[PDB]
Amino acid sequence: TSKKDAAAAFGIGSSIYLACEAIYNRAQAVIVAVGVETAETPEAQASAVIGGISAAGERTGLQALLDGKSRFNAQPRLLVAPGHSAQQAVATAMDGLAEKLRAIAILDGPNSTDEAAVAYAKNFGSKRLFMVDPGVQVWDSATN
Amino acid sequence: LAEKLRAIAILDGPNSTDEAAVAYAKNFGSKRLFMVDPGVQVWDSATNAARNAPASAYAAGLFAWTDAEYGFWSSPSNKEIKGVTGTSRPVEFLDGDETCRANLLNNANIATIIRDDGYRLWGNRTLSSDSKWAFVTRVRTMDLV
Amino acid sequence: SFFHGVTVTNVDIGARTIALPASSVIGLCDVFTPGAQASAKPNVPVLLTSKKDAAAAFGIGSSIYLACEAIYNRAQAVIVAVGVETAETPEAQASAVIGGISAAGERTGLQALLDGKSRFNAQPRLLVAPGHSAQQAVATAMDGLAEKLRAIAILDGPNSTDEAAVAYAKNFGSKRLFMVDPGVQVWDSATNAARNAPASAYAAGLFAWTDAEYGFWSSPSNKEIKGVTGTSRPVEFLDGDETCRANLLNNANIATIIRDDGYRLWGNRTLSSDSKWAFVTRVRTMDLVMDAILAGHKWAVDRGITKTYVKDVTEGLRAFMRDLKNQGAVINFEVYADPDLNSASQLAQGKVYWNIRFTDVPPAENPNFRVEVTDQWLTEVLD
Amino acid sequence: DPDLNSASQLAQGKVYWNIRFTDVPPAENPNFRVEVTDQWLTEVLD
Amino acid sequence: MDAILAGHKWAVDRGITKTYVKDVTEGLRAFMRDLKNQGAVINFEVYA
Amino acid sequence: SFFHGVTVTNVDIGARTIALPASSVIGLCDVFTPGAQASAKPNVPVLL
Amino acid sequence: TSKKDAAAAFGIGSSIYLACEAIYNRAQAVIVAVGVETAETPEAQASA
């Protein structure tokens, strides 16, 4: 529920705290953040964000957002996986998850040319998908 | 078994070209048979890559979704298939051309997956030799009333 | 108990909204010399949206940048430009402009404009091959291409005498062919002199300017051409002579560029054999309301023919033509589901028929005035 | 059932009824027949 | 006959809408009315 | 299923307009002297 | 009836849970799943 709460939970400087910093600098919001461990390859990173169900019988990746109402009484309405939603597999997993929550899954296309943005937006056809193409250039406090 | 339970058996042919799928659907000349030929390409968590799904359980998810939102009297084609990152042997349907290989597959009473990176179904036809029962809406509603 | 609890449903039975597909995308295919200053491969389509982007893709001074400079100095349009390489013989130069398909199944020449919607979401409506449309081989393959895109393939005849243009326009007889005969004499800043332009891209910018200024239902046949300095082989239109040299080319379905300093387009007729599809306004408005309906009713492909389905397609089709009628595009209309075709057998096969009759706005190419003197009111100066 | 409910079968004690219904067909081919006429051109006079 | 011929060269490809014939006629009635109260004509009748 | 999809067809059943071909085009044939100042050939037609 | 019960009954990595994940990602339905063991010969896996 605050910017200091995200740095206390996920550590300051992580790639999900940098998304909570992006939200709390503009609005005063309430985030149900999942947080996954950093996988080795960018292929196996998409396994972590999509997730599924663990061997212990528990949802892991984006699927754990369905516990937002049963555990916090906060059902999410904006589904954001920043950076990983540019992959076709994660954006389709968040496509059907946005109908299990009646949420608006805010996608973001690839940061390449505009031809590769219309070719990416021609894959979805779903009414609960909002796509923001151009990559924002923001100041990094780590690498200055 | 579909005549016993009054169900609709959702089939799927091989992942070869259309010449091998039309020749497979000619064996079936009865209703309660729904053919979805082109294989859905889905992402696998084990190999961390794409996997050719048989695309028989994705039409079943589309059949079970349209009965919740629209109803059992509604055809599940022109509705979005979700969880799909593409189609093995991608089917062409450009604007309205009858020369496309999508309409050359629907004329064998075979539902297809047509859009760019495969995001909807295409076809209402069952594999029936009767002109009356050549609709998956009429077979689903007669067997339910 | 089918369900024990609250059932909140979204019925989704309303009428939809039909929009127009922007009517102003220009297909271009002209030669250029590829290298380090040109960032375009010599057969792929490039989406040029500005004058600086046409120079960064094809290079300054190329024969296709000079056609993009012709459009962007008159209008502000979207150019889907292909670009090709120079052939050694002009007999085999027409084969590179037409193209066809490659060894890898990729369309190369003018056929690459069919990828304009699948790649850039911009389907071209003006098919312009400047300089190469004077050959009959390119223009026959551009008319057949204009039936694939529902476009108006803008031609330009040879810059010889007027009989060479009448004999060139006799071959076609197609309603998607708009021909501008006299070659524009334009300033060339590469040689610091005045060259002769093929006068096809200058009429392309006139079509794309009136769509942004007066609408897609408006003929460009009275509007100014900006970039020119004159006209090669000047044609004559004096005041009101129906036997002028300019009017005899419009009578042979050929548009012209008439006045001193060459600043008017004159002619709104296609090369149509039928007198129905003569005006380029009626051909343009028909392809725009046949493509808005086709690409706007992709929601209604398996919705189920109920009584409220046909009633909410028609009332969403009536509102499309009504929003065109007060806009000025059509005069009146009559949208109605056909009772004589929507039988109980045709509905059972999944076939529903709708009729959209309408009248377009014809361009007033000949306003007559019948002036007379009389002595009817002569006894009115009496009190 | 009009052709089966006979007086000779009423004594058997077995009357017949028919349940017919017309199912909603999916609109798999929504044709549009759009034409350009010159009927309302005289409407442009006042 | 030359004021009308050289003064209506804007209306060569405007398109026949209801406001076109309205504003050519009512732009032509004002030309003859400005001739009537100037003294050139006595009366007029301009109509499509 | 002979076609699955939207079918927009222009039926093209209007009544066509007929125009008058040419009021006065004058065919001429009289003698002349071909040479330097005369740009015509002594048998081909010349549109004047 | 849910994705948890389809993974509790058959386990992840099973070919029938991959079918149940295909249904529950799109709809929310009741699945009567049988589940069989893998046969060696594919000529008799259809008989299984």
TrEMBL record, chain A:
This is Probable bacteriophage protein. Belongs to the myoviridae tail sheath protein family. The chain holds residues 50 to 193 of 386 of the full protein.
TrEMBL record, chain F:
It comes from Pseudomonas aeruginosa (strain ATCC 15692 / DSM 22644 / CIP 104116 / JCM 14847 / LMG 12228 / 1C / PRS 101 / PAO1). The chain holds residues 2 to 49 of 386 of the full protein. Belongs to the myoviridae tail sheath protein family. This is Probable bacteriophage protein.
